[PDB]
Amino acid sequence: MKTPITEAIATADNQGRFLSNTELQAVNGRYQRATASLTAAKALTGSAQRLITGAAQAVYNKFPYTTQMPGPAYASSAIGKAKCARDIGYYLRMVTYCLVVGGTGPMDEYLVAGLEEINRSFDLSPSWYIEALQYIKNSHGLSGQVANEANAYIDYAINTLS
Amino acid sequence: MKTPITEAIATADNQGRFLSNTELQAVNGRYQRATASLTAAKALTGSAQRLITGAAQAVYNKFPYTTQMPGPAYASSAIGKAKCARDIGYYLRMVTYCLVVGGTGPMDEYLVAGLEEINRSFDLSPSWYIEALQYIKNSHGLSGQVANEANAYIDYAINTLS
Amino acid sequence: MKTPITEAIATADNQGRFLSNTELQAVNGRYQRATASLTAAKALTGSAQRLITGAAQAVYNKFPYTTQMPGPAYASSAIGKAKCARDIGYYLRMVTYCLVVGGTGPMDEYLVAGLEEINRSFDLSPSWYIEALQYIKNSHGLSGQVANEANAYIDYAINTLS
Amino acid sequence: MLDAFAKVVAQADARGEFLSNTQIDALSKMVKEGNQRLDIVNKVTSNASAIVTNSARALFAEQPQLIQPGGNAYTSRRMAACLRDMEIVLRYVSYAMIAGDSSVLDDRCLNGLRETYQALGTPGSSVAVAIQKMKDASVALANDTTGTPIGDCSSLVAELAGYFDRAAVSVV
Amino acid sequence: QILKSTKQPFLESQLRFNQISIKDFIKGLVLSAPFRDLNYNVNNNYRFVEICVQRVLGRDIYNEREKIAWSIIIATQGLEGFIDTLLNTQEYLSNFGDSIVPFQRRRIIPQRSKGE
Amino acid sequence: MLDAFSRVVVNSDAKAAYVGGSDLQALKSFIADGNKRLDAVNSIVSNASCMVSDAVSGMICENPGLISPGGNCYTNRRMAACLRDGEIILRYVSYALLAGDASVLEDRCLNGLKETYIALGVPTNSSIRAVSIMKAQAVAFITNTATERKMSFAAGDCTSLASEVASYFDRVGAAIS
Amino acid sequence: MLDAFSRVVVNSDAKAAYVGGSDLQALKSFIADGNKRLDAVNSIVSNASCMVSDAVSGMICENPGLISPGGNCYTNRRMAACLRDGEIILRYVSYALLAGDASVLEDRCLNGLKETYIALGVPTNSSIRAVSIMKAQAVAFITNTATERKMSFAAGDCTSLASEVASYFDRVGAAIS
Amino acid sequence: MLDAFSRVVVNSDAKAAYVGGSDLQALKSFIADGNKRLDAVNSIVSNASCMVSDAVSGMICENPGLISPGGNCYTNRRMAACLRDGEIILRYVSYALLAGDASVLEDRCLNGLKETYIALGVPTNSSIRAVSIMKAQAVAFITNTATERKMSFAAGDCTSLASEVASYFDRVGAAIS
Amino acid sequence: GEEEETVDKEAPRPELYNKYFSADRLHKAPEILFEYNKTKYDRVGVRYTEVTSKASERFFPKSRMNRAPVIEISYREGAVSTASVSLSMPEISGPPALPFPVPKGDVTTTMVTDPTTGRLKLEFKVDGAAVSAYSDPRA
Ligand SMILES: *C(=C)C1=C(C)[C@@H](Cc2[nH]c(/C=C3N=C(/C=C4\NC(=O)[C@H](C)[C@H]4[C@@H](*)C)C(C)=C\3CCC(=O)O)c(CCC(=O)O)c2C)NC1=O
Ligand SMILES: *C(=C)C1=C(C)[C@@H](Cc2[nH]c(/C=C3N=C(/C=C4\NC(=O)[C@H](C)[C@H]4[C@@H](*)C)C(C)=C\3CCC(=O)O)c(CCC(=O)O)c2C)NC1=O
Ligand SMILES: *CC[C@H]1/C(=C/c2[nH]c(/C=C3N=C(/C=C4\NC(=O)C(CC)=C4C)C(C)=C\3CCC(=O)O)c(CCC(=O)O)c2C)NC(=O)[C@@H]1C
Ligand SMILES: *C[C@@H](*)[C@H]1/C(=C/c2[nH]c(/C=C3N=C(/C=C4\NC(=O)C(CC)=C4C)C(C)=C\3CCC(=O)O)c(CCC(=O)O)c2C)NC(=O)[C@@H]1C
Ligand SMILES: *C[C@@H](*)[C@H]1/C(=C/c2[nH]c(/C=C3N=C(/C=C4\NC(=O)C(CC)=C4C)C(C)=C\3CCC(=O)O)c(CCC(=O)O)c2C)NC(=O)[C@@H]1C
Numbered sequence A, B, C: 001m002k003t004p005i006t007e008a009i010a011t012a013d014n015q016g017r018f019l020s021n022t023e024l025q026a027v028n029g030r031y032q033r034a035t036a037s038l039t040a041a042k043a044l045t046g047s048a049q050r051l052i053t054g055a056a057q058a059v060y061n062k063f064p065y066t067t068q069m070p071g072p073a074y075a076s077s078a079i080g081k082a083k084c085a086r087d088i089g090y091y092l093r094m095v096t097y098c099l100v101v102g103g104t105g106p107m108d109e110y111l112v113a114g115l116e117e118i119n120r121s122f123d124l125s126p127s128w129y130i131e132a133l134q135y136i137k138n139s140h141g142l143s144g145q146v147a148n149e150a151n152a153y154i155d156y157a158i159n160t161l162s
Numbered sequence D: 001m002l003d004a005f006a007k008v009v010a011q012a013d014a015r016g017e018f019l020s021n022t023q024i025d026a027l028s029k030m031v032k033e034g035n036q037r038l039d040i041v042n043k044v045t046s047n048a049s050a051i052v053t054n055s056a057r058a059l060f061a062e063q064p065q066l067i068q069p070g071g072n073a074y075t076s077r078r079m080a081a082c083l084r085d086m087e088i089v090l091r092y093v094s095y096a097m098i099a100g101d102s103s104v105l106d107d108r109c110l111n112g113l114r115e116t117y118q119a120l121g122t123p124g125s126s127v128a129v130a131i132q133k134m135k136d137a138s139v140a141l142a143n144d145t146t147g148t149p150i151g152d153c154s155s156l157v158a159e160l161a162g163y164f165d166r167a168a169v170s171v172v
Numbered sequence E: 001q002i003l004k005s006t007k008q009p010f011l012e013s014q015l016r017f018n019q020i021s022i023k024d025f026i027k028g029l030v031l032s033a034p035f036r037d038l039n040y041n042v043n044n045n046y047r048f049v050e051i052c053v054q055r056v057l058g059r060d061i062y063n064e065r066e067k068i069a070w071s072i073i074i075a076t077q078g079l080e081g082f083i084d085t086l087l088n089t090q091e092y093l094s095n096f097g098d099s100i101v102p103f104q105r106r107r108i109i110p111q112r113s114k115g116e
Numbered sequence F, G, H: 001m002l003d004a005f006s007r008v009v010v011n012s013d014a015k016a017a018y019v020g021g022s023d024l025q026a027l028k029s030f031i032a033d034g035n036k037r038l039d040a041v042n043s044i045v046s047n048a049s050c051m052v053s054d055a056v057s058g059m060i061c062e063n064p065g066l067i068s069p070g071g072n073c074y075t076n077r078r079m080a081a082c083l084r085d086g087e088i089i090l091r092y093v094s095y096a097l098l099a100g101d102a103s104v105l106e107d108r109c110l111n112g113l114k115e116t117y118i119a120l121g122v123p124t125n126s127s128i129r130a131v132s133i134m135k136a137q138a139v140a141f142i143t144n145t146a147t148e149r150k151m152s153f154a155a156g157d158c159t160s161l162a163s164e165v166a167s168y169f170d171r172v173g174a175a176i177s
Numbered sequence I: 001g002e003e004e005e006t007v008d009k010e011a012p013r014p015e016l017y018n019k020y021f022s023a024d025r026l027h028k029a030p031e032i033l034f035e036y037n038k039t040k041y042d043r044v045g046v047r048y049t050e051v052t053s054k055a056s057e058r059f060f061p062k063s064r065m066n067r068a069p070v071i072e073i074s075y076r077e078g079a080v081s082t083a084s085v086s087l088s089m090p091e092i093s094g095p096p097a098l099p100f101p102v103p104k105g106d107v108t109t110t111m112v113t114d115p116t117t118g119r120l121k122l123e124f125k126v127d128g129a130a131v132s133a134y135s136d137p138r139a
């Protein structure tokens, strides 16, 4: 788990160093943006069921074959649509964990590592999840620097699927 | 490339030993199954334009969105349909390269290694190419052990994508 | 002990691979030199009793000093000859063991591995030992390709001491 | 590693004699079935990603408590490491199909596999029920009459079954 | 070559179970079949010694005689006999040991900004 | 301890199903072949004094360095113990075949006899030469092809059963290995 | 049940057969002195391998010209073919002992053997010397008067069966004269 | 596949080919009494080695001047050629039993057979005497009326296929008449 | 010297048989095979191979070649309820081959027992076989 605090510890531990004024501004700058990032995590938490089901329908409008084609990898059934809504809820949960810790720690560990082994095995396309995340990027309805923190960790997830 | 000859050579300079009779039998079994292999590579090369344009149409009949979606990754243009047809030209050419040398050497060198990083960067779905290869696997018209050798390198190309 | 089956397995495992059609052909050639090597080491046991001391007299009539020298390391008295119905029977044993497995397996680890330490510190010079099985290579009766496969692992054992 | 020819070498060395003529006519029976061994390993490894993903899919259907959050196979790191070990047994069983004995399967893959799983905490009764899906998806795959002419291959499926039940009793 | 086909997913799991060390993990990577066909079939024995001293030992080659003095180890007892006699040198043990992934030692001079 | 009848229950437990007719078909054929296995193990335990005779007097003629003064079967307690150490391990596999499961062999003896034996100092290659001398001693008795004593059975072919006691005794030897 | 024995020897292929406890009582009752005769065939075939190894080497020990270059015990396939001709007649004379006649000996083994040996260049008077050792070696095993070996038996004589093989071994020597 | 039976023969090339279980009943529906006819070949080819040896030795022991020095069954290359010559006419009459017609026997074996025997000096009156013993054997084996070897069969009559092979042996004798 | 007879061919054979029998189609006949075991996998097959013979087969044909009836008897003392006789005739091979003749000592060689061959040793009766009688340290 990389945080700003568990990264400046690690460069202090590389040099045998007591925590100098170099490593006391890397952890101070997390505190001047933990205000704006924890309101964005609180806002995305409350509007989760609007954003999950709205993005699951915006996938199905762009890619209509996924609701039509038979076989278990598609959203053409009841349980096929339930597992797609589970997956965007897994994706949106790791965005809010990154706004708590201030970096891409929890989606590196719990989401990204080992993801391409799944998407090739179970025949799931990585462009089904760009369209789900590009909905959430410009339909969360945030503004200012609260939107700047949520839009940083959303397109980190787009770049590890692209 | 890994042929049965070049892996019998490879275990010799593993130890740094001379070529014994624990490698002459490996080349001996290659010469047995090369007479049912070059009769397969001849027939796939002779019916290559029938197999390629029939396999492009099997993708377009199963996935009709690819013929009409706008965007660069789909075969809805004139140049989108040409890049699709040379891809199934590339998948048939590495099968007849692998039947000639008797092993999975050319498609390890040219197809397989690095395939995931270009299907993710260019948004190419790997279920398109399994449908292009499943048309070839039961409509080449071969019969017998000549059919049994073409259905082991087409099936090796499928299990990379699957 | 390196069977030609077992290095099709061990050079499918260090790359982390299923048994493809490359290594399936190398075990087919082990099934092609099977019958032409199995008449060799069967009938070499059927004529084994002449070949032990009929080859020993092809050393003492080459070397008269080996019965005449005062030393423990020769067949001069009656105790050295009892080692000489044992120490060249081990050469006759492992040349039968190589024709079971179709490769140079058992004598690569039982015989040849760490042998100059045994030779220099007993003064058991292999000028007797090359001529100990040089009587075997021309008076053992395996004609045809049964001769050449039985003579294939004899002169591998010649060249390891020469 | 050892195959069947390497058995009776080391089963007569240790005592140090030969092998004898009454054993090798059983071993020259084995090369009559040498061509019915290599099709059958080609039947397994051609479908080597369709026996894995069709049986992990039928594993999480009957056991939803592994893909639920807080489960063993929950995250994408531990889903990929569940499909890794489901294919690892498919390699070392088919290695024991081509060789003639178990002794590369239970020396490189089953020697401490359940005590790997007791230390990590994975349900060792539940890996056996994924393997027994892969047993039934491969024995019923290796009885097709397409691609080969018809003949009885029964003993190899018992030999092919007999290493699939050897991984079914290794992991519990 | 950190592609999907060039990864070693069974060697990765034995590091995570603490079965093998880092020194046994570097030895599995030079003996890996992607390292043979991409970095050993396309140069000779006198350039491959320049690879396995720059990357493994982390230093440059001393002079050109050391490439001559090391290249007969690969041609006599093999690449698997070449790595363990290179991983048992004192230059590998006295600053990497049994637990450190190697690196290029002293690439830059501390007052400067250019270096090597 | 596991039973083969217990083996289908925990198979049907994490699966959370009932018992169907599908996996029931293995166990109903196990009933009618139960008497054939019951005709096997009675002759294993009734010629057991011969099988522990040829366990230890047979392995000592092919390495006599243990009766030498200084060996690992020299004194008459270690002479007594090697007669005793082998007559428990065939008593355990007589339990193990009636359940059918090897886990009763594992938890009782085969979890940790190897870690004792290098602190008890005995060699393991001598042990597996004494394990395997009971292996072919066993499989003669189940088939009735033993030379000096031929016993009463019925007529058939228990070579599926005769592989199973050979499927135990290698894991007896691999545990010490 | 000698028809079950004769159908084994008439099928001209490799086929195993064996006798249970009920039909062995039919064997012991149909053949007179079956407690004596089945001992007498067992005393030969327990040591049949040493009988063929001694006698043709005793044929070498009196006729040393067979292992000369140009002799008929040179070129070790041909030396083993004399050993293969050693072992067939011992199995054929034991079944001739067991059936109580030579009618299976004449057609399957003794018909045309003199014409076979003079067409193959076989020295037939040397084989007379080799088979006369077999007449002495079978008598000393039936009477248990062997100098180096002594097997346990029931008490009594076997001199009818000791004289019966001398009738059977002279039929071989008359066939090849 | 009767043509693929013939395509073993007519391409003059040494292969091996078979007929499976589903492919048997296509031939068994086509060929009338195929359960009799496959028994009729298997009664012959299980004793195909013994059929040539009683045929050639009855030719020898009735015509004793053939094994004279100067006779045509001297000089053991010439004896082994005559035993080879009785084998090829046995396999061709066995394949004529399978195919149901002699038209592959007439051209491959009997065509040119007459004057190729006076090309080498074969006494053809002995050769008609040689094949007539094989005519007496094949009516004994198919009807299971051999005097020494009976075989197990399904119960019934086989007198048409007894007469067909006895018709097919007469085409061999008329080819060398 | 074990087979110094590898090609020897004194057949006369003038070329007057070639217009009626070709060289490739010479002594070749269809041999019929039978996997008849009353089973579902029972196959009939024919193959067309070269026919060879030897001169011995007037009285000892290839099915009856070297097939002699062997007897195995299991008998414990007073154990006739479990005692048995068996009978078979396999293709019976002889014992292992006769040795060298040897001078006056040496170490002749042997072999015995059921499982394996494990051969003897021999200084004409006495069987030395690696006891190391030359045991002379120099203190
Ligand atoms: C020359 C080198 C040479 C001979 C000449 C010949 C000597 C010889 N030995 C016998 C008699 C027997 N051989 C027997 C065989 C065996 N005895 C055993 O105990 C084992 C089982 C087996 C193999 C060694 C037996 C049982 C006899 C009869 C009793 C006896 O020992 O005498 C003969 C025949 C008797 C005669 O006419 O002299 C001869 C010629 N062997 C040589 O090696
Ligand atoms: C002279 C020395 C000599 C003969 C005269 C001639 C005897 C002979 N035998 C037959 C008949 C058959 N031979 C058969 C072959 C065999 N019988 C078997 O049981 C085995 C399997 C096989 C090889 C020995 C068969 C089946 C018969 C028919 C049954 C019968 O005996 O009648 C004949 C032809 C019939 C006749 O007498 O006209 C002859 C002439 N062989 C000699 O060596
Ligand atoms: C009919 C197939 C579907 C399809 C194809 C399509 N592919 C591309 C682009 C690329 N494909 C490759 C693949 C390879 N190149 C190789 O050299 C080899 C090995 C011999 C392989 C497998 C690559 C590298 C590209 C990009 C470069 C290029 O060739 O242009 C495209 C163009 C996409 C783009 O963004 O340029 C298409 C349209 N698409 C379909 O719709 C068909 C279903
Ligand atoms: C043909 C006779 C020649 C001969 C024989 C001889 N050998 C020895 C002693 C040894 N030989 C070995 C070598 C091996 N032993 C093995 O088991 C194997 C297989 C792995 C090999 C390669 C060893 C270790 C010994 C010593 C132990 C032993 O006695 O076997 C001796 C005795 C020498 C002594 O001083 O003890 C003899 C006479 N030597 C000759 O000179 C003959 C030509
Ligand atoms: C269907 C999946 C089941 C499951 C799998 C699971 N396994 C692990 C972890 C390991 N498994 C092994 C065993 C092997 N690794 C190998 O490389 C080989 C062959 C050489 C074997 C036999 C090891 C060593 C580990 C730990 C290392 C690793 O692979 O990660 C895990 C945990 C993964 C993690 O990172 O913790 C899972 C989830 N477990 C289940 O619940 C399924 C039933």
Ligand SMILES: *[C@@H](C)[C@H]1/C(=C/C2=NC(=C\c3[nH]c(C[C@H]4NC(=O)C(C=C)=C4C)c(C)c3CCC(=O)O)/C(CCC(=O)O)=C2C)NC(=O)[C@@H]1C
Pocket: F047, F049, F050, F051, F053, F054, F057, F058, F059, F060, F061, F062, F132, F133, F136, F137, F140, F141, F145, F146, F147, F148, F149, F150, I115
């Ligand atoms: C009690 C006597 C049993 C019995 C046991 C069986 N023993 C079998 C083989 C065998 N027996 C021994 C022991 C003996 N022979 C020797 O050479 C030595 C000295 C080294 C001794 C003490 C050995 C070594 C073996 C071979 C086993 C091996 O080493 O692999 C055996 C199988 C043969 C058979 O009978 O078919 C059995 C059944 N025999 C009995 O029937 C009584 C009840």
Ligand SMILES: *[C@H](C)[C@H]1/C(=C/C2=NC(=C\c3[nH]c(C[C@H]4NC(=O)C(C=C)=C4C)c(C)c3CCC(=O)O)/C(CCC(=O)O)=C2C)NC(=O)[C@@H]1C
Pocket: F055, F056, F072, F073, F077, F078, F079, F081, F082, F083, F084, F085, F086, F088, F089, F108, F109, F120, F122, F123, F126, F127, F130
């Ligand atoms: C003979 C074939 C062996 C061998 C036997 C010896 N075993 C010795 C001691 C010993 N063994 C055990 C384990 C024993 N208890 C069990 O319940 C079971 C079965 C499951 C077994 C095998 C124990 C606990 C001990 C120690 C007993 C004690 O300390 O009281 C032994 C030595 C006796 C001693 O040291 O006094 C021998 C000789 N060892 C051999 O060398 C061969 C291979």
Ligand SMILES: *[C@H](C)[C@H]1/C(=C/C2=NC(=C\c3[nH]c(C[C@H]4NC(=O)C(C=C)=C4C)c(C)c3CCC(=O)O)/C(CCC(=O)O)=C2C)NC(=O)[C@@H]1C
Pocket: G024, G028, G033, G034, G035, G036, G038, G039, G040, G042, G043, G142, G143, G144, G153, G154, G155, G156, G157, G158, G161, I073, I074, I075, I077, I078, I079, I080, I083, I084, I085
């Ligand atoms: C002759 C070569 C022997 C000899 C033979 C005698 N055996 C006598 C009784 C007897 N024989 C056997 C073994 C035999 N009968 C069988 O049923 C079977 C195999 C299934 C065999 C091998 C037995 C078991 C017995 C009974 C022993 C007893 O009463 O306790 C016997 C007495 C007369 C008779 O019964 O025929 C004789 C003379 N005895 C000899 O001294 C030579 C060496």
Ligand SMILES: *[C@H](C)[C@H]1/C(=C/C2=NC(=C\c3[nH]c(C[C@H]4NC(=O)C(C=C)=C4C)c(C)c3CCC(=O)O)/C(CCC(=O)O)=C2C)NC(=O)[C@@H]1C
Pocket: H024, H033, H034, H035, H036, H037, H038, H039, H040, H042, H043, H142, H143, H144, H153, H154, H155, H156, H157, H158, I035, I036, I038, I042, I043, I044
């Ligand atoms: C004349 C040569 C025989 C005889 C022949 C009969 N056989 C009859 C039935 C039958 N035959 C066979 C064996 C045959 N069929 C095969 O498919 C194969 C090889 C794969 C062979 C060798 C079988 C299996 C059967 C069926 C037996 C049953 O299930 O009952 C038969 C009855 C009429 C018929 O079915 O054709 C006859 C007359 N029987 C004789 O008496 C002489 C000796």
Ligand SMILES: *[C@H](C)[C@H]1/C(=C/C2=NC(=C\c3[nH]c(C[C@H]4NC(=O)C(C=C)=C4C)c(C)c3CCC(=O)O)/C(CCC(=O)O)=C2C)NC(=O)[C@@H]1C
Pocket: H056, H072, H073, H078, H079, H081, H082, H083, H085, H086, H088, H089, H108, H109, H113, H116, H120, H122, H123, H124, H126, H127, H130, I011, I012, I013, I017, I018, I021, I025, I026, I027, I028
């Ligand atoms: C044996 C019972 C006869 C007899 C037989 C001999 N035949 C000899 C040579 C020979 N036979 C054939 C015909 C045979 N070979 C075939 O390839 C075919 C069918 C395709 C058949 C029927 C041929 C062709 C030849 C040799 C000439 C050639 O190869 O072109 C033969 C050898 C004579 C010699 O070498 O001096 C014998 C003895 N002769 C008899 O006396 C009885 C009646």
Ligand SMILES: *[C@H](C)[C@H]1/C(=C/C2=NC(=C\c3[nH]c(C[C@H]4NC(=O)C(C=C)=C4C)c(C)c3CCC(=O)O)/C(CCC(=O)O)=C2C)NC(=O)[C@@H]1C
Pocket: G056, G072, G073, G078, G079, G081, G082, G083, G085, G086, G088, G108, G109, G113, G116, G120, G122, G123, G124, G126, G127, G130, I054, I055, I056, I057, I059, I060, I064, I065, I066, I067
């Ligand atoms: C050894 C003590 C003799 C001797 C023996 C040789 N026999 C050779 C070949 C041979 N032997 C037989 C006899 C045996 N086998 C059988 O199948 C039957 C009957 C069922 C019997 C009695 C036969 C048939 C043959 C083959 C002859 C043929 O093919 O016609 C032989 C080698 C000759 C060869 O391989 O060509 C030898 C050396 N010869 C001797 O010098 C002593 C006296």
Ligand SMILES: *[C@H](C)[C@H]1/C(=C/c2[nH]c(/C=C3N=C(/C=C4\NC(=O)C(CC)=C4C)C(C)=C\3CCC(=O)O)c(CCC(=O)O)c2C)NC(=O)[C@@H]1C
Pocket: A059, A066, A067, A072, A073, A074, A075, A076, A079, A080, A081, A083, A084, A085, A087, A088, A090, A091, A110, A111, A118, A122, A124, A128, A129, A132, D057, D060, D067, D074, D075, D076, D079
């Ligand atoms: C939804 C947008 C599209 C879709 C979804 C779909 N997904 C699955 C199955 C799986 N998805 C995963 C993915 C993850 N698991 C994780 O733990 C994480 C990190 C938190 C991720 C990203 C896995 C492991 C599976 C398989 C197991 C499961 O059942 O969930 C399916 C089912 C596939 C099947 O074969 O059953 C579906 C249908 N597919 C669509 O059609 C939508 C467009």
Ligand SMILES: C=CC1=C(C)[C@@H](Cc2[nH]c(/C=C3N=C(/C=C4\NC(=O)[C@H](C)[C@H]4CC)C(C)=C\3CCC(=O)O)c(CCC(=O)O)c2C)NC1=O
Pocket: B033, B145, C021, C024, C025, C028, D035, D036, D037, D038, D039, D040, D041, D042, D142, D143, D144, D145, D148, D149, D150, D151, D152, D153, D156
């Ligand atoms: C390199 C890879 C490779 C293989 C996999 C085998 C494949 C193979 N099998 C057969 C031939 C055959 N193969 C089978 C096998 C089967 N039939 C069944 O019902 C079972 C499903 C299956 C066993 C697993 C049968 C029954 C035959 C015909 C009988 C025979 O072999 O004689 C043949 C024709 C030659 C022959 O008959 O032997 C070949 C080439 N050989 C190879 O070189």
Ligand SMILES: C=CC1=C(C)[C@@H](Cc2[nH]c(/C=C3N=C(/C=C4\NC(=O)[C@H](C)[C@H]4CC)C(C)=C\3CCC(=O)O)c(CCC(=O)O)c2C)NC1=O
Pocket: F032, F033, F035, F036, F037, F038, F039, F040, F042, F142, F143, F144, F153, F154, F155, F156, F157, F158, F159, F161
């Ligand atoms: C009181 C104590 C007691 C026993 C001893 C067993 C006794 C026993 N054995 C078998 C029966 C049998 N046992 C065997 C076993 C064998 N036959 C062989 O050829 C092999 C040598 C051997 C092991 C492979 C066979 C083949 C049958 C017949 C099949 C069967 O009905 O079980 C049967 C069923 C048929 C019958 O009633 O006889 C019974 C009750 N059960 C008991 O309750």
